[PDB]
Amino acid sequence: QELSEEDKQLQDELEMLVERLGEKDTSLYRPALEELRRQIRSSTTPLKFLRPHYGKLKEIYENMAPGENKRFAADIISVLAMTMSGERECLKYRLVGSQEELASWGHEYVRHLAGEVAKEWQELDDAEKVQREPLLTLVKEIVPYNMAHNAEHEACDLLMEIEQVDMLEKDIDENAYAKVCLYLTSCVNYVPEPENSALLRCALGVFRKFSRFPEALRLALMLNDMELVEDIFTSCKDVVVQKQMAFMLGRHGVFLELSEDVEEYEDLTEIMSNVQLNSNFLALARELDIMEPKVPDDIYKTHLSARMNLASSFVNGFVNAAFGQDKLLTDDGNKWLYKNKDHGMLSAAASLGMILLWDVDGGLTQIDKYLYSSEDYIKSGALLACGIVNSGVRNECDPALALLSDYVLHNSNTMRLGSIFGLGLAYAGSNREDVLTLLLPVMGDSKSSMEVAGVTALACGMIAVGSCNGDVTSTILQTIMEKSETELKDTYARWLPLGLGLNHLGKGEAIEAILAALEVVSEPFRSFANTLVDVCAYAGSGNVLKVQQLLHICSEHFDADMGAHQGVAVLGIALIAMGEEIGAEMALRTFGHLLRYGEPTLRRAVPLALALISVSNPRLNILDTLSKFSHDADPEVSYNSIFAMGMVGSGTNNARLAAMLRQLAQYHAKDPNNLFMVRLAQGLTHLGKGTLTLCPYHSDRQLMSQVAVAGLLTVLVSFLDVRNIILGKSHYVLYGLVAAMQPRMLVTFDEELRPLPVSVRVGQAVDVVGQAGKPKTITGFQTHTTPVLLAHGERAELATEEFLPVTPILEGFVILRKNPNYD
Amino acid sequence: RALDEGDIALLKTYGQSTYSRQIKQVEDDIQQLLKKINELTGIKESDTGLAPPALWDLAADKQTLQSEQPLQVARCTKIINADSEDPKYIINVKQFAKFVVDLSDQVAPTDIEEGMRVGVDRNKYQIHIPLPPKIDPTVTMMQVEEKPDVTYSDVGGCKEQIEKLREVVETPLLHPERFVNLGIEPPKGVLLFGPPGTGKTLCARAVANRTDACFIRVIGSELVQKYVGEGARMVRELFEMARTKKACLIFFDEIDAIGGARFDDGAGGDNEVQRTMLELINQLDGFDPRGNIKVLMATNRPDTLDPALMRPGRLDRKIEFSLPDLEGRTHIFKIHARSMSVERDIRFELLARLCPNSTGAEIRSVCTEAGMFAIRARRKIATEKDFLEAVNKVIKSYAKFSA
Amino acid sequence: KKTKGPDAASKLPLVTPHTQCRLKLLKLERIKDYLLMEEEFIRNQEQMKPLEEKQEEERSKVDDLRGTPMSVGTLEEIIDDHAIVSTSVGSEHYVSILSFVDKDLLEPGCSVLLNHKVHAVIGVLMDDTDPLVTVMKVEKAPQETYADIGGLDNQIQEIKESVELPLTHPEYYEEMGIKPPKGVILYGPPGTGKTLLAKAVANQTSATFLRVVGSELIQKYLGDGPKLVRELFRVAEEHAPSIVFIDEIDAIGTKRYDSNSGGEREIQRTMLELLNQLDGFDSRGDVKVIMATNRIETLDPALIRPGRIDRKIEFPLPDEKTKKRIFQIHTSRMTLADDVTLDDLIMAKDDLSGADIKAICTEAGLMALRERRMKVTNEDFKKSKENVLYKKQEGTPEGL
Amino acid sequence: DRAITVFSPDGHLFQVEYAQEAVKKGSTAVGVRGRDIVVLGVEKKSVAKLQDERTVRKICALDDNVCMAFAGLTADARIVINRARVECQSHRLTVEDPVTVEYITRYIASLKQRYTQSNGRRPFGISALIVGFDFDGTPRLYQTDPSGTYHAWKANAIGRGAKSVREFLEKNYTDEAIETDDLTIKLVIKALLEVVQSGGKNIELAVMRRDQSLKILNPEEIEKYVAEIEKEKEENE
Amino acid sequence: YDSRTTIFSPEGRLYQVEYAMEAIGHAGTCLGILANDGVLLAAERRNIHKLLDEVFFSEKIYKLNEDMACSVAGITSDANVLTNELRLIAQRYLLQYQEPIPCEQLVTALCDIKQAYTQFGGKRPFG
Ligand SMILES: Nc1ncnc2c1ncn2[C@@H]1O[C@H](COP(=O)(O)OP(=O)(O)OP(=O)(O)O)[C@@H](O)[C@H]1O
Ligand SMILES: Nc1ncnc2c1ncn2[C@@H]1O[C@H](COP(=O)(O)OP(=O)(O)O)[C@@H](O)[C@H]1O
């Protein structure tokens, strides 16, 4: 083999130089290495020739006398070790080396030096803190090089590897901080909890420094630290940032209780209370012309019975939800409930409240007449309708608390159930001390039935979701202890762990104390309760241990039938890491293999986890798999598959999916048990005319709203065993979607808070270039007026650089101000 | 200047990321697990029928095991050739067999007919089960078509063509006067030809106006096929299916390949076409005249073969149209405007004048374009959307003439 | 004989960086963890059996009656109780299966088992691994998305609207009562065409896709060229409603030749059958036929008419911004240089198409990998221009 | 089928059509009116180091007030110029008044029509275009299709890239932007400059100032006008 | 596809002429280099069979006029007649103007005759 003539000549020249450097006398050692190093650091701004001289160069470096000659020798060994590395010999030589300016030895060398520093920083033991400072100083020298030469994302990699994101704040300038913070946010989804909080805290630090509060609030909501949310809300002072914070709290649904000393406090609490949510939503619905009450009959396509009529009423309420415009239950509503049979009048009135949800003024007046109804079920449904109306939306005088005064602890089981569920939906996320101090004593009542006690626990859990309310947990545990185990573990105690999971939602770690106190409970219910509270607390964390513990326990034979907790393990499989697309599309495939070879109880609970992964997101593979498994032999499996399709298509108005359900309705026309819930799935698909989505992931589909997932999980827990409970009595548990029902369109205001007709470009927004933490790139600009339905996969962007939003996140509400360069 | 060996490995290790080798090992393990879990399947059994048939229909499979000695008369099945005066049956078998048997005592000689497939029991080859297959390939399922074609306003009524064919198709099906007042049988045939256009729409209208003996749309291009005898058999089963379906009309369409051109290149170019011609004449010769079945042949040009002079005794009454005038075009506009969300307040007569002899297909096309322009404007209204109706119809007439 | 294929692969192609970094590493670790937890889950579940119930009721009743010896044969016809099956060497059996009878999966023309001796069907080979006569659905629903192409916003919006008239808002023209399968007639320079394919993948993000390129001047006596596509489009209607991409045959296979008779029978058959299928009054289905060509002149007058084939779309040459976007897309995977030499290569360039952009980007890496191997080769700033000349544009004597 | 000078079954004249499509092989050619000056350019980009640039002759004069440019086959074009020049000298011999641009364009179109007629003669696959000041002051531009016809155009835009440059011209053919001679020249540039790279010296412009001789713009002045066009492009952010 | 000489292509090319010009590349080899105070031609003698006598004194190089000389590279049958016509044109100009014919004018006349040969009539192009 024959190299280039000049390449061979230079190779022989370097061979002569190294032999001269390898000679006996050291008087020529210095001149030889002076000549050598100049061309060694030539190609980096050569290394092939000195490939077989590894041992000789090591001997020369060791033989070199201490001083200048030795540290250049260590310099040459280091810059050559990047090729001849059987170990991190580059860094060990460089630590012995000069420690002068390294950045001039080529980009390849400094990048390899940066990584070896990261390896040593991780490798060094706790007792070794001598060399840590020199590596930190070396890191603080290479970060400016990475910032200049667009290497900031790997600079973030090494600083997070060495846990020095605190000085990442001090070094990064705003000119490139947006992509660094986006890179941090992406890493947040996968890093475990202690460094996850560390990256969240530093992300707040960067945005607080750079006056980037609107996205900082998004990150604060990820941190679920209400104290930090209050601190950063105080930190920002401008009127524009104050009012966008209140939209974000209002859109999230959690009410922030503050003082009137702040400027424009009345508007801030109003927009946080979502008082104008209903007015804007109806106004945009009218502007789209989507206001006509869609009859359940022509949804069914009847061109070719008491429970079936009930399902028709429920889907009508789902379609006309948040609207308040439906004469079917308003004019002849009394006739319909009178014609209705048995237990369905409560749900029909609650469905009417679903039509009137978020319509406080309109709903209360139109439900006042039905409040004085004769039947106990109608009265209870009317009271539940009031709670649905006041659910989500906050009010200054809070009419729900005064309206539900005698019914909060009323002796009648049905009347108490409606009020308790109504207060739970109303005070969901309010965390109000007065509401808690009035409903927890109702939890302590012994006259209430087992299911009534469970509903009280559900209400307490959704009110105090993600609050770690100690007295709520103590009452929950005390009520469980007082109740006898034999009657506890029958079919309805499954709500008590749900309240515990909601109260400790997104916290973790401390759950060991709760499960230790719960350890006294017998195995059939303890093994279910401890798993449910664990998965709910560790939801949205990517803790793939908690899923594999679920996978291990749901694998057991478990065949009195304690194997029911295999189902909550399946729900926990999706619940832990439903956050991003990864951890959801593959746990989806896990559910496929669960159905592919699994227990009857396992395959009963799998569609519930499938719906939890992609609620309101009609993924084609999900819809096909659910449709194929909707005809399984097990009736409960078919029921779960029917409901799963309704949830994944909920609030989408997906035409082809609706056709599939209509085909399923024809298939299941003979059996009403599947038929009425196929109708239910269609109503879920057309719920709110598709204007309100049901996915609990908001703020660019990366924030977990505690109230919405609380109500969603309550429905899925109920749908663990609907083969018994929806057939029997739980026609009221389906109304937990109010928390998860949030609008998915854009409402644009201005600095004077008036609706703007500003047009935006909307289309698929998926990553194209991954060279750095670049913002998600949108394609398919189908621009039109600002009311646009924001679904999964596709986002919105301003048509021109003329209106500057308060936050680049474009969903729900946003204020657009005139750009200084607008012309 | 290749300088690759050794050098390429060094520069492959020259740069990279700090853990590029790590992710490579990670993704190789990802692919290793992917193959392992594709090998570690779920239902790892190609044979299906796991339990729904293997729990209760299995219990009756015990019954068929108790009756396993019977129900074994399957063996092999083959056609029959002919027979003697009565008892003996000389048969050609798919085993090339010169086969004769005493027909099984359970089977009378009346049921078995020449050219029908019968299974033979290997022990004695008795005529046990004479299967009437009546198997239809997928293309034949296309030759047969829907019966209820649904009636319209004479599908853009061209009063000449329809009224000439009603006395030859509708009247014989009504059978009010064919027997006595007019000579024995109605006119022997109908040739509803014409340029691409109104052809066969009047046939569909006559099908809807008549009884359930409804037409099937067969294509001559489909009928001509590779090899020899397949087209002959296809025409035979075409007549069999039409005869069985209440003696329905047989609608031959695009007769320019089944009859071919007026010539054959060397009598070897299109000879299977000639094979189909001989058998089709043998089928639609009628033999004994019968006012039950009807036949209609529709092409665009009179390119029929030499039987074009025998057909005056068999296939007479050649009629055509496909020449819509102003009154024809505006009536086609009215029946098409019956569909969609349009109303006749539009001055559609102006557009009928604009397009001279625009068939009925283009008028349907123009109406389709008008609906497409309405949805493009996002207005589902079309009753009063007449100016927009006129605008889209005239601009597309411009595009059709010159684009 | 074919309905669907098990899609349990393509594990989350959304690797956001696509380059070696810590974020990509963590995503791969989460991917690889999720694979083991599944292999955990299924293995833990398959062996930790819920219950040991005899011989799973399999070997007790059916496996013995299925027998050890078996032979495979096709199933021909179905009767109420028995089954008419055409086994090997032209044998036909009229026997009632009652063991492992999955009536949905047996179907006519599928391989079934025969237990020998008293020949009774006892099972069906559902895989059968041999539906190989005419295969065009093998490339169905291509994974290419909108993001793969850029700078073609006007055409992407136009094609999306033409194909989202169905699926999205199907009641729009359902109330208008037209149900138009007009399709799209695509123009474009000969330097493009698979963009006519790449812009088609925008609609291929929904449902399946079929391709007929080159085919033939259907000399076949049966013709059936456009007619088996009609059957395949019918099969597409059985599946998710697919599109038929017939680029370069709407021009050659459907040519506006002045000759009337004696014209290879394609004008007699192909053009007429194309119009019959493109007319909504004959065939239903949400199938949209995308007609793409590089010769607008050869448009047949039947194909010219927007009355049956509407939604004419013209593909123009890329502009300066479009050239910047396509070069960015093609060079994003390769990390061209740290100096980002982007506009110098396109500012003066004219009449450069997508295929040329891909070729020059590929040749830029090849020339650097030839001997200039420097990771992000510092020569790439001008070698990209060195291989953008590359001659090979057009060559024909002198004549000038 | 048939590709000779006979009528086809659908009409047309396919040999004539092929000749009309042959102009695409060639070079761009732009030119404008303005009542002060007619200027036309070609923008040739092919010059090897060993060929003399003198004899490209993409634009040529006829009678020191009429000039024509190439679009298509060069040999046919040169024969056309020779015959047309002979005819201009004949129409100067008889009818002593100098030739008019319309007259010479009519003669060229008549010759092309004659050659399209009959099967013997190839239909002169060249598309010519002629500018020049008439005897009565008014400068005119005619463009002759190869078949038989000529048309008086404000802008010609003939050759490769003809469609795009013609669209650009008709988009902003502002008479207020015509006005002065320099404005006219700078309007021809940045329009012909748009075609292909046009980087260093590809533009080959020509000038006819009223009664002056055919002026071929010097390369340095061409670069000066390009710089002025760049200056106009600047300050437009 | 080729036919009688006076045709075009569906694209619009003179493929007969292009084929002839490409065929000119095949066979024969001449080169001309221009320098100050002298311009020269170099020709490759194709057939060097020892059985020739080289009495024509020139095969590729032809003296066409007092002030010019040419070198053909095509088929000799057309080359001879083309050289004769070129000499005739040069001498006709000399007779008419009593002055040596400029080289550009002579070349334009020859290329005009070749363009005429490839333009009209059923005559082969001068290869
Ligand atoms: N008189 C008419 N009135 C209304 N629509 C017509 C009329 N004639 C033709 N059409 C329309 O033309 C289309 C096809 O017409 P038709 O079924 O008669 O012909 P075909 O079978 O397609 O063949 P061909 O055009 O060669 O006769 C249909 O959309 C039909 O509505
Ligand atoms: N504007 C573009 N952006 C991104 N990719 C493109 C673009 N144009 C073409 N491509 C890609 O380059 C390939 C060749 O494109 P195209 O020009 O359509 O091929 P051809 O010229 O061979 O018909 C296609 O497969 C397509 O994916």
Amino acid occupying residue A432: R
Matching residue, tokens 């790997």: A154
Residue C188 among known ligand-binding residues: yes
How is A357-414 classified by DSSP, letter by letter? TT-HHHHHHHHHHHHT-SSHHHHHHHHHHHHHHHSSS--SS-HHHHHSSSTTS-SSHH
CA–CA distance, C152 with C150 (Å, rounded to integer)? 5
* Residue C307 touches partner B, C-beta closer than 8 Å: yes
Chain E partners within 8 Å of C396 (Cβ): 13, 18
Q: How does B44-80 read in b/e, with b if 16+ C-beta sit within 10 Å?
A: eeebbbbeebbeebbeebeebbeebeeebbbbbbbeb
Half-sphere exposure of A452 (CA within 13 A, CB side): 22
Q: Write the DSSP assignment of C253-292 as a string of letters.
A: TS---S--SSSTTHHHHHHHHHHHHH-TTT--SS-EEEEE
Whole-angstrom CA distances from B201 to B78, B98, B208, B298, B332 are 43, 51, 11, 11, 12
Q: In whole angstroms, give the CA distance from residue A665 to residue A671.
A: 10
Is the separation of the CB atoms in B42 and A596 below 8 Å? yes
Q: DSSP assignment, residue A729?
A: T
CA distance A182 to C59: 59
**Alpha carbons within 13 A on the beta-carbon side of A709:** 32
Give the closest residue to D56 by CA, choosing from D216, D190, D226, D199. Answer: D216
Q: Name which of C62, C65, C88 is nearest C76 in CA terms.
A: C88
Between CA A780 and CA A793 the distance in angstroms is 12
Name residues whose C-beta falls within 8 Å of residue C245's C-beta, 6 or more positions apart in sequence.
C196, C197, C200, C209, C210, C211, C212, C213, C290, C292
- Number of Cβ within 10 Å of residue C234's Cβ equals 18
Helix, strand, or coil (residue A564): helix
Q: How many CA atoms lie within 13 A of A527 on its CB side?
A: 19
Q: List, in sequence order, every residue forming a beta bridge with E42; answer none if it has no partner.
A: E31
Residues of A in contact with C16 (CB under 8 A): 186, 767, 770
Inter-chain touch B57–C98, beta carbons under 8 Å:
yes
User: In this structure, what token pair is assigned to residue B122?
Assistant: 């290997």
Task: List residues bridging with B217 in a β-sheet.
Answer: B251
Please check whether residue C75 is in contact with residue C83, taking contact to mean a CB–CB distance below 8 angstroms.
yes
Is A732 in contact with A346 (CB distance < 8 Å)? Answer: yes
Q: How far apart are CA A505 and CA A468, in angstroms?
A: 8
> Chain B residues with CB inside 8 Å of A46's CB?
none
Cα A460 vs. chain centroid, distance in angstroms?
A: 22
Q: Which two tokens stand for residue A353?
A: 């409240």
Q: Print the SS3 string covering chain D.
A: CCCCCCCECCECCHHHHHHHHHHHCCCCEEEECCCCCEEEECCCCCCCCCCCHHHHCCEEECCCCCEEECCECHHHHHHHHHHHHHHHHHHHHCCCCCCCHHHHHHHHHHHHHHHHCCCCECCCCECEEEEEECCCCCEEEEEECCCCCEEECCECCECCCHHHHHHHHHHCCCCCCCCCHHHHHHHHCCCCCCCCCCCCCCCCEEEECCCCCEEECCHHHHHHHHHHHHHHHCCCC
| DSSP per position, A243-271 | HHHHHHHHHHTPPP---TTSTTHHHHHHH
Coarse DSSP helix, strand, coil percentages of chain A, rounded to the nearest 5 percent: 60, 5, 35
- Contact yes or no for D65/D208 (Cβ under 8 A): yes
Report which of D27, D50, D26 is spatially closest to residue D202, judged by C-alpha positions: D27
Task: Return the best residue to mutate from C195, C334, C393 for the ligand 2 pocket (most ligand atoms within 8 A of CB).
Answer: C195
With tokens 């002959």, the residue in question is B232
Q: Cα C35 to chain center, whole Å?
A: 28
A26 and chain B in contact, CB less than 8 A: no
For residue A277, the cross-strand partners are none
| Ligand 2 neighbour C326 (Cβ under 6 A) | yes
**Which regions of A585-715 does DSSP assign to beta strands (E)?**
692-693, 697-698, 703-704
Structure tokens at B308: 């074009």
Q: CA–CA distance from C220 to each of A527, B220, C223, C270, C370 (Å)?
A: 71, 14, 5, 11, 49
Task: List chain A residues with CB under 8 Å of C49.
Answer: 557
Q: How far apart are CA A154 and CA C22, in angstroms?
A: 7
Query: Does residue D79 contact residue E115 with C-beta atoms inside 8 Å?
Result: yes
Strand partners, E63: E69
Place of tokens 């969903």: A811
In whole angstroms, give the CA distance from residue A361 to residue A366: 9
Rounded to a whole number of angstroms, the distance between the first and last alpha carbons of chain E is 19
The overall longest dimension of chain B from CA atoms, in Å, is 105
Q: How is A260-315 classified by DSSP, letter by letter?
A: TTSTTHHHHHHHHTTHHHHHHHHHHHHHTTTTS---HHHHHTTT--HHHHHHHHHH
What residues does B120 pair with on adjacent strands? B76, B127
Paired sense of beta strands D214-216 and D205-208, if any: antiparallel
Angle at B378 between CA B375 and CA B380, to 5 degrees: 65
Residues B389 and B379: their CA atoms lie apart, in Å, by: 12
Could you tell me if A154 lies within 8 Å of chain C, comparing CB atoms?
yes
Residue C90 and residue A551: Cα distance in Å, rounded? 51
Interatomic CA distance for residues E127 and E77, integer angstroms: 9
**What are the structure tokens assigned to A169, written together?**
């704040």
- C254 annotated as ligand-binding: no
Ligand nearest to the CA of C142: 2
Task: Name the nearest CA neighbour of D33 among D172, D133, D167.
Answer: D133
Structure tokens at A515: 């499960």
Q: What is the resolution of this structure in A?
A: 3.5
Three-class SS string for E65-77? ECCEEEECCCCHH
Residue B197 annotated as part of some ligand binding site: yes
Residue D216 forms beta bridges with which residues?
D206
| C187 Cα: distance to centroid of ligand 1 (angstroms) | 29
Angle between helix axes B361-376 and B387-401 (nearest 10 degrees) is 120
Residue B99 tokens, joined: 């086969």
Q: Which residues of C64-89 are buried (b: 16+ CB within 10 A; e: fewer)?
A: ebbbeebeebebbbeeeebbbbbbee
Q: Which atom of ligand 1 is nearest to the CA of B194?
A: 27
Asked if D9 lies within 8 A of C399 by C-beta distance, the reply is no
Q: What angle separates helix A213-223 from helix A193-209, to the nearest 10 degrees?
A: 160
Q: φ and ψ at C145, to 5 degrees?
A: -120, -175
Which of C178, C232, C270, C372 is the best residue to mutate to test the B interface, defined by the most B CB atoms within 10 Å of its own CB? C178
In eight-state DSSP terms, residue A23 is S
**Any idea of the CA torsion for A209, A215, A221, A227, to the nearest 10 degrees?**
30
D73 within 8 A of D20, measured Cβ to Cβ: no
* D197 neighbourhood in chain C, CB within 8 Å: 348-350
CB contact at 8 A, A676 and A310: yes
CA distances C177 to B152, B341, C289, Å, are 16, 7, 20
A596–chain B nearest CA distance, Å = 5
User: Taking CB atoms and an 8 Å limit, are B19 and C62 in contact across chains?
Assistant: no
- The correct CATH number of D1-237 out of 3.40.1160.10, 3.60.20.10, 3.40.50.2300, 3.40.50.280 is 3.60.20.10
Token duo for residue C281: 């009054």
Nearest ligand 2 atom, CA C144: 27
Count CB pairs under 8 A between chains D and E.
61
Q: Given an 8 Å threshold on Cβ–Cβ distance, is E13 in contact with C398?
A: no
Pairing of strands B216-219, D30-32: unpaired
DSSP A741: -
Compute φ and ψ for A615, nearest 5 degrees.
-65, 135
Report the residue from B57, B59, B371 with minimal CB separation from C101: B57
Q: Where are the domains of chain D?
A: 1-237
Instruction: Tell me the residue type at B230.
Output: E
Q: C397 and E13: CB-CB below 8 Å?
A: no
Query: DSSP label at E98?
Result: S
Separation between Cα atoms, residue B120 and residue B99, nearest integer Å: 10
Q: Find all residues with CB under 8 Å of A108, minimum gap 6, and list them.
A: A44, A82, B14, B15, C375
Q: How far does residue B199's CA lie from ligand 1's centre (Å)?
A: 6
Whether E112 and D4 lie within 8 Å, measured CB to CB: no
φ, ψ for residue E35 (rounded to 5)?
-135, 170
Contact D199 C348 (CB under 8 A): yes
Task: Give the integer Cα–Cα distance in Å for D164 and A245.
Answer: 52
> Would you call C303 exposed, middle or buried from its count of C-beta atoms within 10 A (0-12, 13-18, 19+)?
buried
**Closest by CA position to B142, among listed B258, B230, B251:** B251
* Cβ count within 10 A of residue D177: 13
Q: List chains adjacent to chain D, taking adjacency as at least 3 C-beta pairs closer than 8 Å.
A: C, E
**Residue in this structure with the two tokens 């924030």, named with its chain if needed:** A703
> How many Cα atoms occupy the beta-carbon half-sphere of B361 within 13 Å?
22
